[PDB]
Amino acid sequence: MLVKPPYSYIALITMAIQNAPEKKITLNGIYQFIMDRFPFYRENKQGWQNSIRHNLSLNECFVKVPRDDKKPGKGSYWTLDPDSYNMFENGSFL
C-alpha cells in the first residue's frame, strides 16, 4: 500500500532544502529528492512537477541565487533568505 505525504506542496519544498546535501539546490534537483524520498510521485510525473515551479515564483519567501552567467548548464539555485539583495555593505544605511 502507498500513501501520499500529508505535507503540503510548500512544506515539501521547504523540507527538500533542509534535507538537501547542499543548501543551494537546482529546480531539477528538487524533483529528484521527492522521487526518492516519496516514490508515489514516480507513478505520476506530469502534473506535480509543474505546480512546484508555479509556487517557486509567487512566494517571495524563497531566494533565487543563480551562479555566474559565465558558467553554462545549470543556472538556478534555491535557498532561504530575506531581501538580502544589497545587504553586502553594512553601516552605509541606518
Curated annotation (Swiss-Prot):
**Name of the molecule in the record:** Forkhead box protein C2
Q: Which disease is it linked to?
A: Lymphedema-distichiasis syndrome: An autosomal dominant disorder characterized by primary limb lymphedema associated with distichiasis (double rows of eyelashes, with extra eyelashes growing from the Meibomian gland orifices). Swelling of the extremities, due to altered lymphatic flow, usually appears in late childhood or puberty. Most affected individuals have ocular findings including corneal irritation, recurrent conjunctivitis, and photophobia. Drooping of the upper eyelid (ptosis) is a variable feature of the lymphedema-distichiasis syndrome, occurring in about 30% of patients.
Post-translation: what modifications?
Answer: Phosphorylation regulates FOXC2 transcriptional activity by promoting its recruitment to chromatin.
Species source reads Homo sapiens
Q: Which residues of the full protein are shown?
A: 69 to 162 of 501
Q: Where in the cell is it found?
A: Nucleus
Q: What does this protein do?
A: Transcriptional activator.
Q: Which domain of life is it from?
A: Eukaryota
Tell me which residues form the DNA-binding region: 3-94
Q: What is the lineage of its organism?
A: Eukaryota, Metazoa, Chordata, Craniata, Vertebrata
